[PDB]
Design a protein around this motif. Structure first.
Motif, PDB file in Angstrom:
ATOM      1  N   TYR A   2       0.781  -1.185   0.045  1.00  0.00           N
ATOM      2  CA  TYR A   2      -0.179   0.086  -0.053  1.00  0.00           C
ATOM      3  C   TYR A   2       0.838   1.245  -0.021  1.00  0.00           C
ATOM      4  O   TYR A   2       0.483   2.208  -0.778  1.00  0.00           O
ATOM      5  CB  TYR A   2      -0.990  -0.037   1.186  1.00  0.00           C
ATOM      6  N   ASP A   3       1.986   1.297   0.874  1.00  0.00           N
ATOM      7  CA  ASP A   3       2.845   2.502   0.857  1.00  0.00           C
ATOM      8  C   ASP A   3       3.460   2.524  -0.426  1.00  0.00           C
ATOM      9  O   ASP A   3       3.937   3.710  -0.683  1.00  0.00           O
ATOM     10  CB  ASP A   3       3.754   2.325   2.107  1.00  0.00           C
ATOM     11  N   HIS A   4       3.695   1.606  -1.296  1.00  0.00           N
ATOM     12  CA  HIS A   4       4.468   1.811  -2.679  1.00  0.00           C
ATOM     13  C   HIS A   4       3.217   2.552  -3.564  1.00  0.00           C
ATOM     14  O   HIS A   4       3.747   2.558  -4.683  1.00  0.00           O
ATOM     15  CB  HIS A   4       4.989   0.536  -3.146  1.00  0.00           C
ATOM     16  N   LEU A   5       2.034   2.270  -3.292  1.00  0.00           N
ATOM     17  CA  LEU A   5       0.964   2.517  -4.275  1.00  0.00           C
ATOM     18  C   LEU A   5       0.289   3.879  -3.749  1.00  0.00           C
ATOM     19  O   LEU A   5       0.646   4.311  -2.700  1.00  0.00           O
ATOM     20  CB  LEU A   5      -0.092   1.628  -4.227  1.00  0.00           C
ATOM     21  N   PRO A   6      -0.101   4.818  -4.804  1.00  0.00           N
ATOM     22  CA  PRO A   6      -0.726   6.204  -4.604  1.00  0.00           C
ATOM     23  C   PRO A   6      -1.827   6.269  -3.429  1.00  0.00           C
ATOM     24  O   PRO A   6      -1.811   6.875  -2.758  1.00  0.00           O
ATOM     25  CB  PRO A   6      -0.916   6.631  -6.052  1.00  0.00           C
ATOM     26  N   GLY A   7      -2.644   5.231  -3.765  1.00  0.00           N
ATOM     27  CA  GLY A   7      -3.878   5.087  -2.917  1.00  0.00           C
ATOM     28  C   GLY A   7      -5.135   5.574  -3.111  1.00  0.00           C
ATOM     29  O   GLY A   7      -6.163   5.824  -2.345  1.00  0.00           O
ATOM     30  N   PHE A   8      -5.377   5.878  -4.598  1.00  0.00           N
ATOM     31  CA  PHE A   8      -6.711   6.295  -5.083  1.00  0.00           C
ATOM     32  C   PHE A   8      -7.829   5.342  -5.272  1.00  0.00           C
ATOM     33  O   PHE A   8      -9.078   5.486  -4.931  1.00  0.00           O
ATOM     34  CB  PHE A   8      -6.104   6.592  -6.724  1.00  0.00           C
ATOM     35  N   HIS A  29      -4.939  -1.708  -6.147  1.00  0.00           N
ATOM     36  CA  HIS A  29      -5.216  -1.615  -4.667  1.00  0.00           C
ATOM     37  C   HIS A  29      -5.941  -2.858  -4.258  1.00  0.00           C
ATOM     38  O   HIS A  29      -5.552  -3.290  -3.011  1.00  0.00           O
ATOM     39  CB  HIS A  29      -5.931  -0.169  -4.396  1.00  0.00           C
ATOM     40  N   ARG A  70      -7.196   8.475  -1.404  1.00  0.00           N
ATOM     41  CA  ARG A  70      -6.609   9.424  -1.894  1.00  0.00           C
ATOM     42  C   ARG A  70      -7.534  10.550  -2.527  1.00  0.00           C
ATOM     43  O   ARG A  70      -7.078  11.743  -2.503  1.00  0.00           O
ATOM     44  CB  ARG A  70      -5.298   9.263  -2.765  1.00  0.00           C
ATOM     45  N   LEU A  92      -4.739   7.431   4.909  1.00  0.00           N
ATOM     46  CA  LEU A  92      -5.824   6.549   4.362  1.00  0.00           C
ATOM     47  C   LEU A  92      -6.011   5.469   5.101  1.00  0.00           C
ATOM     48  O   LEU A  92      -5.387   5.032   6.015  1.00  0.00           O
ATOM     49  CB  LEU A  92      -5.006   6.152   2.918  1.00  0.00           C
TER      50      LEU A  92
END
Ligand SMILES: [Cl-]
Ligand SMILES: [Cl-]
Ligand SMILES: [Cl-]
Ligand SMILES: [Cl-]
Ligand SMILES: [Cl-]
Ligand SMILES: [Cl-]
Ligand SMILES: [Cl-]
Ligand SMILES: [Cl-]
Ligand SMILES: [Cl-]
Ligand SMILES: [Cl-]
Ligand SMILES: [Cl-]
Ligand SMILES: [Cl-]
Ligand code: NA
Ligand code: NA
Ligand code: NA
Ligand code: NA
Ligand code: NA
Lengths: 123, 123, 116, 120, 123, 123
Positions: free
Chosen positions: B12-18, B23, F83, F113
């Protein structure tokens, strides 16, 4: 001998959304396919992957891994003025560029701003 | 060594999180890894892919193709009443599913609706 | 693989649902000899070979989420004759451990699931 | 709901395409032991719920024999026949003490003492 | 001795690239650093601020507060034809110019239309 | 005497746009000023800054540097789902959260998040 314009449109038919990372990949695939005379190869492989039950997204990733030119050509650099010139959906996928990015390693293109900053478009 | 919660968090920390298909794929990969005692090899491969220059999105796809547990693995089925119960960043990523969907064929999960209908979440 | 040949000898008949299941188990075995160990032990426990095959799809962690393979053919005639009495419409997302051997997809687009 | 044995057989028969298979005959065995243990309602529930879970009718029948208490150590029915050529419509050697939940639908007992077991 | 061109590029690389007032401030700081012969002082101060944990935006503001020339220097006057020539991400950040504006007091530059109106760019 | 609500709106009229980093900073400054009993010293310094020809943006940053409660103040954490729940203008200046973040070092707040990912809102 399918045109790059027509193959682009066929691929777009399978990918809802506008200005997405995967639409940008289609553009990269069709230009590089056209320039290496491998549009027909790519089209046949795209059709064959869908027929095996692959998602269009998976089909495109499989093309970047199998079709020769995609390990001959780096992610295209696209010159733009500022960051807002990048399509809205593509922006969600922007990352710092690794030393020398590969297309088959999940990098569609590299955006270069007027101030010299580069941004890697991840799939 | 590593737990599923600790590997999810790393991903998750390597991904943007949209809230994209990638995800949702984090939960999917780590559940299969937990259930089949594969979390250590998944972690090792995930970190080695990044160190090789992969985008995290590509690294997650590599897991589904390289880790033996994801061979013939079916996308999990999420039961919902309506279509509007799905996150918006996944909304434009929903297609009709092929007969027997595979994760490595580019399928994150299947949503099953009240009226019997199914929608597939493509990568 | 000679694991399939060991399984075939215990199952009389040709082109049956369980014959197809041997083919499915063995291929997904490559893509295992723990399968072979569990099978021969189940027989020694007094299981019918058919039950022994079902136990492999239930116990072995691979088959817990493994989906049946898709076999692309022309029409209903391409399906082995004894399999045709076991054909059912496919469930949303089929799994082998839930009694599905394979999915036949025809040129038409119509899919038929082979139950155990 | 108190479902009858005659009723539950036909409910199960609708889900099993064709006629004269081991799974067809397993329905009879399940419904016979279900009636004798008043568990036809828990069988109906498990059979209808297993199908809703994504199981084939055949898988659902096997699961009943493995999970429903009355099938524990339960022997397959013995069908007394004269010769092999009397068996309608596979047929293996019989283990020492055959159990339904180990994949045996019934047992054929020949007039000359030989036994043949019908596998699922 | 670092050049104005190289210091700009370093600062740009630490910023997103939308073309906000902080982008405009890079050019202002480096031009005046050149005039005060303090490009090396500014570079070392900027890097020291980042190591202390400052956001790059705060690092730039600190330079205007800590490097003496920004106490005296006028926000540079940029002559343009119309409001369209001012970058989009700056259009919102425009304010009426106070008497004798100061950079250390939060003013990046002044845009002057040939109409006669002066518009101040706040930080 | 001044309230938290009244000071917010006095500060809002000086700032442009909606959902911006500086608008978030106003909320952050007024909430902490209320909780630390320092709204009156913050209001007095803001007005004095403006009267000296400071841009409102600069006046806000000056508060974080000069008012005693901000000397050891770490930014507040705002818990959101994904996000996309961050205002569009605030999204333009999201960064990795540095170790031990501080408001006076340029961090308005931290967005956390549901998946545990944290994003630092630079000014
Ligand atoms: Cl389509
Ligand atoms: Cl073609
Ligand atoms: Cl390579
Ligand atoms: Cl765990
Ligand atoms: Cl890799
Ligand atoms: Cl997509
Ligand atoms: Cl079991
Ligand atoms: Cl179950
Ligand atoms: Cl029970
Ligand atoms: Cl002064
Ligand atoms: Cl003046
Ligand atoms: Cl500090
Ligand atoms: Na993503
Ligand atoms: Na865990
Ligand atoms: Na036994
Ligand atoms: Na910039
Ligand atoms: Na900090």
């Amino acid at each position: 001998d399918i045109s790059a314009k027509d193959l682009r449109n066929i691929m777009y038919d399978h990918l809802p959304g506008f200005g997405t990372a995967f639409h940008q990949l289609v553009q990269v695939i069709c230009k590089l396919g056209k320039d290496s005379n491998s549009l027909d190869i790519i089209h046949a492989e795209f059709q064959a992957s869908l027929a095996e039950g692959d998602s269009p997204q998976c089909a495109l990733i499989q093309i970047t891994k199998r079709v020769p030119i995609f390990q001959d050509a780096a992610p295209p650099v696209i010159h733009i003025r500022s960051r807002g010139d990048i399509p809205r959906a593509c922006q969600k996928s922007l990352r710092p560029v690794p030393p020398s990015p590969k297309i088959d390693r999940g990098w569609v293109c590299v955006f270069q701003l007027q101030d010299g900053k580069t941004l890697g478009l991840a799939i």
